[PDB]
Amino acid sequence: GAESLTVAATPVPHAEILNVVKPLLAKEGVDLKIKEFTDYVQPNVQVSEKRLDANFFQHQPYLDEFNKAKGTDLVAVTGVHIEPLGAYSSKYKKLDELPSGATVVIPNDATNGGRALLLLDKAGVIKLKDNKSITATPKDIVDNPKNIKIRELEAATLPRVLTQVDMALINTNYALEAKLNPTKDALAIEGSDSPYVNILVARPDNKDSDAMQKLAKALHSAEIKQFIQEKYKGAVVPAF
Ligand code: MET
Ligand SMILES: [Cl-]
């Protein structure tokens, strides 16, 4: 009979990708059971608490910081895709239009906050210190001529505050659920050669299990690459 494999995922793109791989896995004796979560904490907690076998929602910087903060030992299995992060505005059409004292909201977790600040640096809105890392904070800003006010709120909440700020830097999974189009709507956007490949994550006990390996291989398949390309039209970039 089939091997059970339970995977927590954010709904878009992750759970969509998993729904498309699920039949391929069934044909290799693996019964993939997908559980959707809307947040960036519970998928890890569920795996670490031995409730689910794996998850698919985060990048490696986030994982490493999560294990540090929580004292857990979740491990990456394979990389799947990149979601270049965009800056969105309901009020302005290009960065040059941002007013003095503009409110710019970014995620309040260490890695996605740092990532957002790095995009602001790349786009020339602010400048970060020369020795900055990818966990930069607003304290690391060395130039802010427009006196931008950097606001920090939980990642999932940013689409809901978009109309109440001048600009928001929104994780693509959340942007796509909100019907934002990163390639058309973004005022600035990351490149895809970045630290932020989204990874399948599991535990030491199952990373090298037969079922886990079959899932990992399916997630590098030509078929999944095609799905990602046609479905997300460049908003989600295959990492293989
Ligand atoms: C929980 S780390 C952020 C994950 C999100 N899908 C991104 O790539 O931006
Ligand atoms: Cl753990």
Side-chain angles (χ1 to χ4, degrees), residues 1-92 94-138 140-240:
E3 290 156 338
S4 180
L5 182 62
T6 53
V7 187
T10 39
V12 181
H14 309 69
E16 299 191 321
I17 290 166
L18 295 172
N19 287 324
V20 172
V21 293
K22 172 162 178 170
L24 292 178
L25 280 175
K27 297 301 215 180
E28 312 184 83
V30 171
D31 180 20
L32 186 63
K33 301 175 192 150
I34 299 157
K35 283 67 162 61
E36 299 194 14
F37 288 86
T38 61
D39 73 301
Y40 282 172
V41 176
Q42 298 312 126
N44 274 341
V45 172
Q46 288 273 329
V47 179
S48 287
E49 292 185 351
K50 319 180 177 308
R51 299 179 192 277
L52 300 177
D53 296 319
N55 65 54
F56 179 44
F57 82 101
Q58 75 202 302
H59 46 63
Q60 190 89 47
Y62 185 90
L63 174 62
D64 293 343
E65 177 57 24
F66 196 103
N67 282 325
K68 178 183 183 294
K70 297 313 202 308
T72 51
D73 78 331
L74 299 179
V75 293
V77 180
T78 199
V80 185
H81 70 264
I82 307 114
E83 294 172 17
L85 189 125
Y88 305 90
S89 176
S90 70
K91 298 181 192 194
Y92 302 102
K94 51 181 170 163
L95 295 174
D96 280 343
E97 295 174 2
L98 294 170
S100 176
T103 53
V104 180
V105 64
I106 71 178
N108 67 0
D109 62 284
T111 64
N112 294 291
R115 168 185 199 181
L117 289 169
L118 289 176
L119 178 56
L120 295 173
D121 174 287
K122 197 190 193 164
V125 175
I126 65 189
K127 187 164 217 302
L128 295 169
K129 66 190 194 189
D130 187 73
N131 62 317
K132 87 280 192 179
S133 76
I134 70 167
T135 42
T137 69
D140 299 330
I141 294 173
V142 298
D143 196 27
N144 186 6
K146 287 197 169 166
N147 200 42
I148 304 292
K149 301 164 190 133
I150 297 288
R151 308 297 203 216
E152 306 170 59
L153 295 171
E154 202 280 327
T157 75
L158 304 196
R160 275 193 311 264
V161 303
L162 179 65
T163 62
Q164 302 159 257
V165 301
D166 297 322
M167 190 162 68
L169 277 63
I170 303 178
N171 294 88
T172 294
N173 71 287
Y174 291 128
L176 290 174
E177 291 192 78
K179 308 311 194 72
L180 303 167
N181 185 322
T183 63
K184 300 185 198 179
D185 298 340
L187 283 65
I189 194 156
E190 293 178 326
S192 59
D193 265 36
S194 76
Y196 309 107
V197 174
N198 283 221
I199 44 169
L200 171 68
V201 169
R203 295 192 303 265
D205 62 78
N206 62 9
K207 166 161 173 170
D208 296 306
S209 68
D210 180 71
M212 197 71 63
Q213 292 177 338
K214 284 172 171 168
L215 178 57
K217 180 159 157 202
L219 290 167
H220 283 195
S221 67
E223 291 79 19
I224 285 296
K225 172 182 264 199
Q226 176 57 44
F227 168 75
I228 289 167
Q229 285 171 339
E230 75 177 73
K231 180 74 179 172
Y232 307 107
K233 292 169 173 188
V236 180
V237 178
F240 61 87

